[PDB]
Design a protein around this nucleic acid. Structure first.
Ligand SMILES: [Mg+2]
Ligand SMILES: [Zn+2]
Ligand SMILES: [Zn+2]
Ligand SMILES: [Zn+2]
Ligand SMILES: [Zn+2]
Ligand SMILES: [Zn+2]
Lengths: 131, 505
RNA sequence: GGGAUUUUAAUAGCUGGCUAUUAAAAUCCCA
C-alpha cells in the first residue's frame, strides 16, 4: 500500500534528524564530517533568465543559479519534523528556491546555513547588495 | 541512489503525486511534471492544495556515525557492561485506516517494570503549509490473536502525558542503578519507530544541577538532567537499544523464551513481552556464555558487604568445625583453594567447575557424590546445587529479595552483581530438606582486655558476666551478620548442630 | 497492515547477461 518517497541512502541521515534535539546542527555535523548530503531534490528546468531572488512563487534563476522545489530543500520537510518557524509554517514549501551554482552539492545545507535579505530578498553574500 | 525505502512512505489514498513546489522528493512528484533529464517542469496545471497525507515512520536506521555523537545501537559486549540499564521494551500497534493505508502507529507500550501505557493513535500528516504530528484514524489488527487490542482503541491518552509518565517511570526504576537507559527490544523496527515519539538524541550532556550524566531532556526548559533531577521532564535523552533477535535466535519470542523459562507465563500484553525479552537477553548473556573478565563498579556497600560475608563465614566455619568433632572438610565451588579458617585443624579438599588454579578439582555436583563425601563436612558457600547433602554448611542467596546488586533473572533466578556478575538459580526451601536454619550466635576464644546476650558463646558468659572487649566484638559481629542477612544471604546447617556443644571449650 | 530471503511477470536502463521500480507466488519475523 501507499507510495514510496525516499531513497535508502538518505535514510541514515533523516532518521538522525528525526531524533536529534537540534536537527540543523545534526545535519551540518553529519555533512561536515564527510557524510553524503541529501539527494532526491526536485530540481527544475529553467531558462536561466530570472531575477535571481532567493525564494519566489515561480522559477527565477539567473545564469549562475539553479532552481529547486522549496519543499525538497527544506530539512524539516524532508525529515517530516516540526518546523522552528513562527506558527509552524514552512517558508520554502509551495515556493521555488534559487541556489548558487557553486553550491548545488548540498542545497539543504545551503538553506540551513544561509538566510535571505529582508530588504532586497536576495541571498546574503550571493546577490544581496545593501551596503 | 536507486534502492527505495519504506521510510516516509506516502500513505494517502490520493491517486496522484504532488506538484514540484510541494513534493518533498523527486520520487514523490507526479510523472506529468518529470522530463527525460530527471528535471521537473512547472506546468500551468493548477495545484490541488489544500491536502493532508499521512507519512509513514516505518524504517528508521540509527546507524550514522558522527564525531561527538555516541553509538546508541550497542553490541553484545557493551550491553553486558550496561546490564544495570536493561529495560525491556515492547510495542503493540494499530493500523492506519480510513483516510490512509500503509503505516502502523503505536497503541500500547510495555516495559519490563510491568507497566503498560495506552496511547491515542498519532501519526505525521503532511499538509500544504508543512507537517503536523496529530491524531489519525486507526484500527486494531484483524484476527483472533489481536482481539485483546480492541478495548485499547477506546482507552488511550495524549502523547505529551504518556511521555512524562514514561520518563517518571524510568527515573523511579533506574535512579540508583545506572545513569543510562538501555531498551532491550526483540524486533527493533516498530520499537524504534515508537521510540521516536518519546526519545531525543544528541551529544552527551551533563545534568544541569549536578555532575551526573544527563538522561532526560526538558523541551519547555530546553535542559538536560539525570534521573534524580528529571521531575517534569518529557523526553528520554540518549537511550541505548538492543535487538535480541540479532543475537542468533530462530523463531518468535515466545518459543525462544519458553525454551528456557517457565516463570513468566501470563496473558498477551506488551509488558509481558518486554519481561520475556529482557529475560531472554539475561539468559543469552549470563547463562549461555560466561565472560568473567567484565568488572562492574561498586554502588552502595559492596566492599563492606564482602568483608561481612568473610567475617560471618569464618565464624560459622570455625564453630561448625569445633562442634560435632568433624575432622574433614570438602569445599565445593572454591575458585582458588583458599581455606577459610585453620585454628581448628581439619583436612581440606577443594572442588570447582571452572578452577582458576590447577590445585582445585574440576567437578559438577549432582548428589551422586554424597557417598563420596560422607566422611567430612561439605561447604557450599555461594555454591548453587539443586539438592544439598545431609551433613553440610550452606550459604545461599535468597533470590526473592531484589536490591541494587540483585536484578531479576531467568527462570526465577537473579543476577547478583558485585565486581563480577553471577546468575543464581531460584531460591527453593525444598533444596534444604536435609538441613536446618542456623540460629544467631557468636563464638569468642581470645583473652579479655553492659551487655546481656543468651546466644553469645563467651567465657564471661560462662561465668555469668560480660566484658567490654567481648561486648564490642559481639556488637560488631551483630552489625556484620545483620548486613549479611539483610543483603539476602541465608545460612543452612546440618541437623545435629546446637550451640550448647560450643560450651565445651 | 510492515518487512526479509528465493522465484516469476511487466516496465525502464546499461553492456547474451545484469541492475532498478512495480506487481504476483512461497517461507519466516513483526502488528
Ligand atoms: Mg509484542
Ligand atoms: Zn519546510
Ligand atoms: Zn539585501
Ligand atoms: Zn542531576
Ligand atoms: Zn523468562
Ligand atoms: Zn571477656
Amino acid at each position: 500500500a501507499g507510495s514510496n518517497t525516499e531513497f535508502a541512502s538518505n535514510s541514515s541521515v533523516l532518521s538522525l534528524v528525526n531524533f536529534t534535539v537540534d536537527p540543523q546542527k545534526a545535519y551540518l555535523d553529519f555533512v561536515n564530517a564527510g557524510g553524503a548530503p541529501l539527494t532526491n531534490c526536485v530540481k527544475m528546468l529553467t531558462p536561466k533568465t530570472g531575477t535571481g531572488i532567493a525564494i519566489s512563487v515561480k522559477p527565477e534563476s539567473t545564469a549562475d543559479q539553479e532552481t529547486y522545489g522549496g519543499a525538497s530543500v527544506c530539512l524539516y520537510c524532508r525529515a517530516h519534523i516540526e518546523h522552528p518557524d513562527v506558527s509552524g509554517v514552512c517558508k520554502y514549501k509551495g515556493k521555488f528556491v534559487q541556489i548558487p551554482a557553486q553550491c548545488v552539492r548540498d542545497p539543504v545545507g545551503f538553506c540551513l546555513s544561509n538566510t535571505p535579505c529582508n530588504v532586497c530578498q536576495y541571498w546574503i553574500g550571493y546577490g544581496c547588495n545593501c551596503d | 541512489s536507486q534502492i527505495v525505502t519504506g521510510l516516509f512512505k506516502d500513505c494517502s489514498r490520493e491517486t496522484s503525486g504532488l506538484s514540484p513546489a510541494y513534493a518533498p522528493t523527486y520520487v514523490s512528484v507526479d510523472d506529468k511534471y518529470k522530463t527525460s533529464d530527471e528535471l521537473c517542469v512547472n506546468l500551468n496545471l493548477p495545484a490541488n492544495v489544500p491536502y493532508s497525507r499521512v507519512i509513514s515512520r516505518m524504517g528508521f536506521k540509527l546507524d550514522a556515525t558522527v564525531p561527538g555523537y555516541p553509538k546508541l545501537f550497542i553490541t553484545r559486549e557493551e550491553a553486558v557492561r550496561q546490564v544495570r540499564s536493561w529495560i525491556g521494551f515492547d510495542v503493540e500497534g494499530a493500523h492506519a485506516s480510513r483516510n490512509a493505508c500503509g503505516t502502523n502507529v503505536p497503541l500500547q507500550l510495555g516495559f519490563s517494570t510491568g507497566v503498560n501505557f495506552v496511547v491515542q493513535p498519532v501519526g505525521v500528516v503532511d499538509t500544504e503549509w508543512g507537517n503536523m504530528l496529530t491524531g489519525i484514524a486507526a484500527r486494531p489488527p484483524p484476527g483472533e490473536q489481536f482481539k485483546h487490542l480492541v478495548p485499547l482503541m477506546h482507552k488511550g491518552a495524549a502523547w505529551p502525558i504518556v511521555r512524562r509518565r514514561i520518563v517518571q517511570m524510568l527515573s523511579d526504576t533506574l535512579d540508583k542503578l545506572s545513569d543510562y537507559c538501555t531498551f532491550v527490544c526483540w524486533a527493533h523496527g516498530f520499537a524504534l519507530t515508537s521510540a521516536s515519539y518519546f526519545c531525543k538524541i544528541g551529544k552527551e550532556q551533563k545534568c544541569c544541577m549536578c555532575n551526573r550524566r544527563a538522561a532526560a531532556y526538558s523541551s519547555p526548559l530546553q535542559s538536560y538532567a539525570c534521573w534524580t533531577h528529571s521531575c517534569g521532564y518529557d523526553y528520554v535523552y540518549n537511550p541505548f537499544f538492543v535487538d535480541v533477535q540479532q543475537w542468533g535466535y530462530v523463531g518468535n519470542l515466545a518459543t525462544n523464551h519458553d525454551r528456557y523459562c517457565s516463570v513468566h507465563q501470563g496473558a498477551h500484553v506488551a509488558s509481558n513481552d518486554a519481561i520475556m525479552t529482557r529475560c531472554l537477553a539475561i539468559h543469552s548473556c549470563f547463562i549461555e556464555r560466561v565472560d568473567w573478565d567484565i568488572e562492574y563498579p561498586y554502588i552502595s556497600h559492596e566492599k563492606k558487604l564482602n568483608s561481612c560475608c568473610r567475617i560471618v563465614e569464618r565464624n560459622v566455619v570455625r564453630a561448625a568445625l569445633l562442634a560435632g568433632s568433624f575432622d574433614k572438610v570438602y569445599d565445593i565451588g572454591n575458585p582458588k583453594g583458599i581455606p577459610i579458617v585453620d585454628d581448628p585443624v581439619v583436612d581440606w579438599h577443594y572442588f570447582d567447575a571452572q578452577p582458576l588454579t590447577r590445585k582445585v578439582q574440576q567437578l559438577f555436583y549432582t548428589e551422586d557424590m554424597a557417598s563420596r563425601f560422607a566422611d567430612g563436612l561439605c561447604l557450599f558457600w555461594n555454591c548453587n546445587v539443586p539438592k544439598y547433602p545431609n551433613n553440610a554448611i550452606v550459604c545461599r542467596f535468597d533470590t526473592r529479595v531484589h536490591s541494587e546488586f540483585n536484578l531479576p533473572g531467568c527462570d526465577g533466578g537473579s543476577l547478583y552483581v558485585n565486581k563480577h556478575a553471577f546468575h543464581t538459580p531460584a531460591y527453593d526451601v525444598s533444596a534444604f530438606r536435609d538441613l536446618k536454619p542456623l540460629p544467631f550466635f557468636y563464638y569468642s576464644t581470645t583473652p579479655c582486655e553492659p551487655l546481656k546476650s543468651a546466644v553469645c558463646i563467651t567465657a564471661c558468659n560462662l561465668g555469668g558476666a560480660v566484658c567490654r572487649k567481648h561486648a564490642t566484638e559481639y556488637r560488631e559481629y551483630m552489625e556484620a551478620y545483620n548486613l549479611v542477612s539483610a543483603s539476602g544471604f541465608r545460612l543452612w546447617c546440618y541437623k545435629t548442630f546446637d550451640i550448647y556443644n560450643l560450651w565445651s571449650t
